[PDB]
Design a protein around this ligand. Structure first.
Ligand SMILES: CN1CCN(c2ccc3cc2OCC(=O)N(C)CCCN(C)Cc2c[nH]c4ncnc(c24)N3)CC1
Ligand SMILES: [Cl-]
Ligand SMILES: [Cl-]
Length: 354
């Protein structure tokens, strides 16, 4: 059952050619293709050495830079597995890893759709508040655990969060006259730890995908765990409205958006940054008459204007969000503090215990 090197074929970009029926490491039998990415691909396998159970296999491209990154991801995943003996912290648990002819492969449990793909297949109709609450709680629980072990994710976004099972019921919305999908179980796992960084490792100047990137990173003031809290704030917003909080493509614009939505950047941050090009007379400087300047002015409103209802549970979500989106990383709510916020008194007994 071993694969000959004749068996192994790669395309122009370094991706493994996989077909239904193929075998890896004399153990995994490919049964479906789950998706692709700039990193490689994700296939569904049966693990014959564990009674034919289902696994998702992440197959990394055979390119040096991808391979090297995968090796650090495995170290992070190993740490997670050793610290979560009882399987309760909701970060995906590696079952195996290997090098298949230069493709690093990592095996995980089979999960459902990512929260972004689900949101898109629902035509960007947002999750109901109770789903936002349960998912928020789980994100805060999982990243609390990662933070307590001297790790920072650095790249949180909706596609990195998967449902355990993404089966849904189809309901109808009187308010907006259309169909809506509602996931039946809102259990989730944080995946991809391909940028997760230890406290003792080198911290690059810029991390995070732009839309989820915090101000300390744009102003090159250094980052640590609070970076993940900012990203969680932007994520919860996007689950609640269904659209991105910061629909931005460059720094100066991104900072204006921050000020329109959140209020003024604090002075002590401005005096400390080397990125003085964004400032004049101690205040953010920009062209209001430009395409970008007109876009922000028409489209970016104070955070509270985005509430869809005015009842207590919505007031509590927005209070938590504001506290996640504090400009000053040192003042931003920690995830241990977030888990004690009144928003989460709203959870069912079942959801709170996992
Ligand atoms: C347009 N397409 C874009 C790609 N889409 C998929 C498909 C399948 C999975 C993930 C995505 O996207 C997100 C993604 O690529 N990552 C977070 C990196 C891979 C993390 N994977 C290895 C985590 C993982 C563990 N168990 C899994 N079970 C199922 N699916 C997984 C699983 N991953 C589909 C839609
Ligand atoms: Cl690949
Ligand atoms: Cl300007």
């Amino acid at each position: 059952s071993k694969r000959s090197s004749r068996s192994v074929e790669d395309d122009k970009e370094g991706h493994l050619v996989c077909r239904i029926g193929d075998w890896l490491q004399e153990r995994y039998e490919i049964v479906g293709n789950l998706g692709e990415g700039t990193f490689g691909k994700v296939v569904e396998c049966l693990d014959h050495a564990r009674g034919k159970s289902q696994v998702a296999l992440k197959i990394i491209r055979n390119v040096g830079k991808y391979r090297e990154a995968a090796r650090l991801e495995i170290n992070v995943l190993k740490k997670i597995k050793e610290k979560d003996k009882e399987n309760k912290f909701l970060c995906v648990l590696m079952s195996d890893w290997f090098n298949f002819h230069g493709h690093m492969c990592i095996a995980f449990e089979l999960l459902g759709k990512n929260t972004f793909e689900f949101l898109k297949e629902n035509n960007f109709q947002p999750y109901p508040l109770p789903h936002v609450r349960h998912m928020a709680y789980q994100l805060c629980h999982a990243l609390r655990f990662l933070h307590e072990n001297q790790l920072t994710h650095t790249d949180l976004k909706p596609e990195n969060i998967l449902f355990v099972n993404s089966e849904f019921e189809t309901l109808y919305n009187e308010h907006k006259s259309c169909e809506e999908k509602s996931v039946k179980n809102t259990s989730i796992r944080v995946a991809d730890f391909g940028s997760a960084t230890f406290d003792h490792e080198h911290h690059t100047t810029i991390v995070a995908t732009r839309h989820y990137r915090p101000p300390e990173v744009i102003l090159e003031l250094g980052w640590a765990q609070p970076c993940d809290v900012w990203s969680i704030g932007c994520i919860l917003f996007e689950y609640y409205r269904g659209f991105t909080l910061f629909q931005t493509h460059e720094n100066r614009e991104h900072l204006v958006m921050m000020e329109k939505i959140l209020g003024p950047i604090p002075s002590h941050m401005i005096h400390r940054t080397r990125k003085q090009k964004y400032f004049y007379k101690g205040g953010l400087v920009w062209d209001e008459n430009s395409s970008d300047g007109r876009y922000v002015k028409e489209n970016c409103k104070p955070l509270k204007s985005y509430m869809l209802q005015d009842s207590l549970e919505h007031v509590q979500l927005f209070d938590l969000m504001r506290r996640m989106l504090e400009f000053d990383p040192a003042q931003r709510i920690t995830l241990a503090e977030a888990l004690l916020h009144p928003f989460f008194a709203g959870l069912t007994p079942e959801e709170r215990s996992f």
